[PDB]
RNA sequence: CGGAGAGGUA
């Protein structure tokens, strides 16, 4: 629970709990980022493959 | 390289070939405005018109030179206004959309001030615009010599343009408001205020309706005179007494004087009231069909307004057995896949079936529903209901022809049913729901394919046909007709095509409007 | 004034030849030379001329006599 | 066009309406990058009828071998749908499947669509065609001068305004020491603090800033002073958000009707109420850059000083030579007093003549200063100085 | 506080039926406020005088014809509706209506009093033909309040009136054609002022513009007392 | 507050902005009903069982039920952040159904059919038949009416053609392309092609003498020779290719 | 003939809401006397409200300040909906002066004997710094209708101080109106009906005087009509 | 106001 929820709760008439909570939605942009800027102990995607 | 241009020479026409005393708008929609008019903005009146400005006001003594005109124009002051009025109130502007597809795609209206920062656009003339006030934006140009007006004016008033001139038949016509409210005029009920008695002319029939002592709907005895054109030109009052409604005869007095009454007397749908103009045109002629025009549209959009027709969730009725038709073309859907695992029945045969039963099954719902749409509205007369033209809202909506068809309504009620998968083939599981219930995600899916597809299909037309019509305008641009007689008697045949083994087009429209090349015969 | 220019049209069947008188007529009285046939109501040449084209007051034969005779006056 | 395996990776009714339909895509909900670069859904795993809560991230190659049962059809007791025939996809294309027969389900309902279909409520009530549209809409809403939740949401606002960057999340959990509409202090807590002392979280608060589009981006403090908040709630709300829920536009009353035919085609009629709510009423913030360059005829200057103009545009002007931060201007007006240094003095004799007349004086450095564009006004915000190393600052620096 | 009053109001008449009647300028939104308001005064309440009852020689059913008239007695019924009428004296009076011969009985074959003035020249009320080439017709002429339908009546009477005494629709006001229509108006900078046009035809039994300033004199009396 | 088209839904197939007013109607009116109940200053309990049926209406539907919040406080202050309606969440494809809309409705003591019978306060008269009345949420979108506006007489011009453009002080004349131009072919309009094309598009002698014309008071025009063709004539001479002019 | 509708008892719902009663109303008219009252009391009321705000602090509207959890924006739109009535000034300057932490209201502002403010309760803004001071220069005027605050910068060429803000001016003390139109029976005659006509207004006006000043306008309008010029 | 690229609009 959220205290900024706790605030103002908005009614859901959804009939299926989420499964699946919605995951981070930049996680595209930083994921692909994180893979080219890191460090590498192999050559793998990123500037030690390059 | 700029030699060469896309499409056509750069700077002769296009690109793009600007002009001054040229603006562009967003449009509004001006129902209060004669069909010759049209609403642009004050300032866009003030900073298009400057030159006249500047020159009425040196004209007038209000400036000396045309820095103080300059001075005026920027203040904005009220003098400033009576000039524009001035210069505004004969001289007329050409309104133009952006993809120009005909010539009625550009037309000169008298522009009407508004106050408002959007240039409003007669109601009747957007569906010649082919524009649709969903964020379309115009543009307006200025004619400034007398022979721009004078010509503007004879040719390309929107008054002047009241036949389309690709095939004859009128483009200006009631669309969807005007016929709506026209539609809930002429609607009759079998009981309601003010039924079985008897009135003298429509003047009374609008005392009763609008005092709220008589309803619209009513069948009412009213002594009418109703003039018809006879002998060779002249007017003949034929006073009668008729069975109407009161709505109708509020509608007949608004009638252009000179018409049959049989043309109001009936429901109105949008054929109707292109009858009704067409009627009008050849019988009276030019001003009086532009009053017709003018006169009903203010009328349908008052009484559509009045009527307070509304879409809502309870005035589209899903069918009672829309669901026994469903089940029962599951249970037929669900025996020919039996026999398909049976290997009674090939992959394609049985793909064919399927579609024929979810065809059959689609129609059956769409004629339940418009079954009960056309009936709902039952009213006791003396202990017995009778059938009437429902008050249900969607059903004017659509049988009017305002805006939607029985395909169009048959999946908000019904069911949109069957459409083309990637590749162009008909999904075997048609859309079992509509609008007015659950999609599932896989339906709503499948029907994101149709309109993708539909969209895609729209941009690359569009594309192909803008540079088509280019091509036929590049190969036929010097045809001028400059002769009046040739005097060849070589000609073509004219026949009513019968393709296939039905007739598809008759051989009236063919030749009609067509010069004879011989002198025909009877057939022996 | 008018706005509907069906009865030049069926005084002028042409209605091109229509424009060019119209114009003519209408630039002789807005500039100087000539004073309308037809009262006015603050109105622009352009409608001035439609409505007396609409009459049957001027067209191009009473144009072109206008002019000659204008011209005999004129040069002496 | 759409592909039977475009499903769930990238949304179908959210593309451009232009001429570059089904090329420009937006990924689904749930889809993400695989290892390799292909887009992968998350699909609930069947082991026999149950539908466990473990997801695995099918590829679009893997998704095809297997049968996905559809999010609908709910499910009773602990993982079985209710249909013995469910609703499935093999290879693109809807069928009925057996519960015993499935491989996948999908994880939620709403892994079909973009972030921007998926605000749209009843969207199984709209064509297509038209809620592709409205969702390529929701993108151009402006915001609007004060945010205002929707009464009927989808529940995706809360996510949107939080993964969005225009929500000041408080990093660390504790007690708001310090609420301000420009800054938020909190006093953290005890048990999230770092080895010795860090004391105080502080959030600055963008402010009035033009985001890319001359639109207003500013970020509303809804915290009071002592309220207790813990780390990945909202501090203060973002533009077009309220409460931490995304505030696209606004809730209006409505009547459906054809009133007098002012609203013909989808032409809209609006109450006065509404403009006098100072609702669906927005701020536009403006960029305009005056570059001071140095040329060959000698370097540019930012001065009050600006040669032969009326000292009612320089009153709003300060002796630095830019307008006061809150001063109100209009087109045409002088916003920053560029002047470049004049190669020559050279003057045409109808130049004399006009100057003679009309008094005008003669300088040796031109007015190069930035006007305010013709047709718009507005009020002084923000004014940015860049000033490289080897220039003396002034004062406004 | 500054108000704004209409400068110049405009006039158009056709005889003394047709009147075209436009005020400018009206401030936003009075213009369709005055207008519906004497409207609604005009229709649903109008002082006035029209007929009331008929008198019945012949058969007392309304669905046959009368004997030496080719019409039914409907649609005399109907004529004597558009009939001017104007009552200077008492309310409820009587007139008489006895022509014999073949032809147009008019609204000239009436008696002429002076409690019962006819402005209305010429009108066609019967037509008689050879079977008895005779009308005797009595009615009553009473003053009344806008339009009260018969049929209305008919349910709110528990008395009937003796035999062929027929009730009869009552067109009481004197106007039996209202409407209005408000459009843009233009002073100085603002364009959001409202020309008013009222368009109006009457019975002839009264000056239109009579009837307008008189239906406005009877609102002004509604609103007076409320003023200090 | 707003007025939209009804004949919108029966072609463009978008009636869930029918739903979205109905939906909207019953969250605001659950909004309206306790509004009145903040106004009376009604005891904290009584607000605490309305909020709770509130969020409890719906079958089969995930929540969660209060009291889990605070007592009084917390409640208040849900209260007060939901006197301006109530949020409602619609998940797209397992949104609520029409029976849900029609009970959250006549919670709101409203016209579970959707419609009230609305008086046109233009006229101050009600209709034949009630209307559809709630609350939907629309967009103000980047379209502005101000920001696409423009129009103009006289202004800038290129330095290597008499075409109007240049800035936002002042842009431009619209571009009148050859479609229009094929448009004003189709009808007689060849005066207008003329003034459009040459006078007040290109010849720069032309521009300045109309101008002039139209300032003395008078609507007169010169013939012209636009400078488009003489740039095309130009460049056609610069690769050794001649153009010349057929002297009348 | 003709009665008179007559004044009955005007009962308050609550400071803000009030039912008027006509009860003396022939038939016909009803409906008539509603649309006209209520189209006259949406259009034509005077009323005070604001329209210059001189906060010390802030120098635009795009500007905050310090201690404050509301923007100088979400000053202008509460002060917006000040309800306030003025009796002998046209033209009146409040003047708000507060420090401390706590919730700025609007019965903080320092009240005039000229000046009533009618709603005391009114949230200003919340001042969190313990030691800030808000200092606003409100000026509040009569007026009719709604003027957006871009009519007067055109009257004057730009607002020559810098510290006063503009705020859109609704001088429209009534913001909803209700007329019902019941059979009433009475001994006066035997055909009458009265009229309720329930308003909800800020309670900057007395319904009295509402009502009677909607008459006097429209009686004032009706004046052309009763006697024609030409 | 010299020309490319992108988005959105119709």
Known sequence: YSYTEKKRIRKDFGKRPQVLDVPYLLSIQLDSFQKFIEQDPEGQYGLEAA | DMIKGKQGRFRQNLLGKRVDYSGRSVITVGPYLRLHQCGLPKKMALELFKPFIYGKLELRGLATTIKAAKKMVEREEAVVWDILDEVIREHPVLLNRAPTLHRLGIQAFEPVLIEGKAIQLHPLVCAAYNADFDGDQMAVHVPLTLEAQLEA?????????????????????????????????????????????????????????????????????????EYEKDANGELVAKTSLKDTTVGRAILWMIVPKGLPYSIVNQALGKKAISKMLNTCYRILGLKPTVIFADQIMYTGFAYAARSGASVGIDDMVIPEKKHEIISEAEAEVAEIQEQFQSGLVTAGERYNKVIDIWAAANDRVSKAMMDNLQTETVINRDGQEEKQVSFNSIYMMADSGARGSAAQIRQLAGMRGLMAKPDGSIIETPITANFREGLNVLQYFISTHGARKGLADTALKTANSGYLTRRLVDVAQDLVVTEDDCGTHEGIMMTPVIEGGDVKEPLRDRVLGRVTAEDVLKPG | ARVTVQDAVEKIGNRFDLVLVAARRARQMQVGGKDPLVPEENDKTTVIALREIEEGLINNQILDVRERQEQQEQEA | DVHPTHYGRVCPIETPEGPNIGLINSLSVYAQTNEYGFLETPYRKVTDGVVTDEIHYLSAIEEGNYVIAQANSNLDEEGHFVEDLVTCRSKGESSLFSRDQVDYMDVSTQQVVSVGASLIPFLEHDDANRALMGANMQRQAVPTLRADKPLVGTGMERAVAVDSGVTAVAKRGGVVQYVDASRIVIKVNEDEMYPGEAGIDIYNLTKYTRSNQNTCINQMPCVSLGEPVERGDVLADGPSTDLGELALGQNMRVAFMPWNGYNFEDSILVSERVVQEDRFTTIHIQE?????????????????????????????????????????????????????????????????????????????????????????????????????????????? | TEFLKPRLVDIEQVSSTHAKVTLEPLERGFGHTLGNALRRILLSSMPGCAVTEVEIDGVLHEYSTKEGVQEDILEILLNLKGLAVRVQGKDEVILTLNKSGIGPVTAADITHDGDVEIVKPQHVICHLTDENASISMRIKVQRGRGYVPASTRIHSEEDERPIGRLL???????????????????????????????????????????AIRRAATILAEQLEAFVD | DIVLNPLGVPSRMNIGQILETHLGMAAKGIGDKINAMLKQQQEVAKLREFIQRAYDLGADVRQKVDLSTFSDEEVMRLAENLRKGMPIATPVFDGAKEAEIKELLKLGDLPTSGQIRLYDGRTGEQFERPVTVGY????????????????????????????????????????????????????????????MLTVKSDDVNGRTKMYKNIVDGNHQMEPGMPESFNVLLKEIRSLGINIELEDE
């Open chain 6, 136 to 195: 939907m949420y629309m967009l103000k979108l980047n379209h502005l009416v101000d920001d696409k506006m423009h129009a103009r007489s006289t202004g800038s011009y290129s330095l290597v053609t008499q075409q109007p453009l240049g800035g936002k002080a002042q842009f431009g004349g619209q571009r009148f392309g050859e479609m229009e131009v094929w448009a004003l072919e189709a009808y007689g309009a060849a005066y207008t092609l003329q003034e």
């Open chain 4, 288 to 397: 305009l850059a005056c570059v001071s360059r140095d040329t060959k005829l000698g370097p540019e200057e930012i001065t009050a000083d600006i040669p032969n103009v009326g000292e009612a545009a320089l009153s709003k002007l300060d002796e630095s030579g830019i307008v006061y931060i809150g001063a109100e201007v209009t087109g045409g007006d002088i916003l920053v007093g560029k002047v470049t240094p004049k190669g020559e003095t050279q003057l045409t004799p109808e130049e004399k003549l006009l100057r003679a007349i009309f008094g005008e004086k003669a300088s040796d450095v031109k007015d190069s200063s930035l006007r305010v564009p013709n047709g718009v006004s507005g009020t002084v915000i923000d004014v940015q100085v860049f000033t490289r190393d080897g220039v003396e600052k002034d004062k406004r620096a």
């Open chain 5, 168 to 210: 009869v629709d009552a067109c009481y006001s004197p106007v039996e054609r209202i409407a209005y229509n408000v459009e843009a108006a233009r002073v100085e900078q603002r364009t959001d002022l409202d020309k008013l046009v009222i368009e109006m035809e009457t019975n002839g039994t009264i000056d239109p513009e009579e």
């Open chain 2, 153 to 225: 004016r004879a040719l390309m008033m929107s008054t002047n343009n009241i036949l389309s001139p690709a095939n004859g038949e009128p483009i200006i016509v009631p669309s969807q408001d005007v016929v709506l409210g026209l539609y809930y005029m002429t609607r009759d009920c079998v009981n309601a205020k003010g039924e079985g008695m008897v009135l003298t002319g429509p003047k009374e029939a609008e005392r009763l309706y609008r005092s709220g002592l008589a309803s619209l709907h009513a069948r009412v005895k009213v002594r009418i005179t």
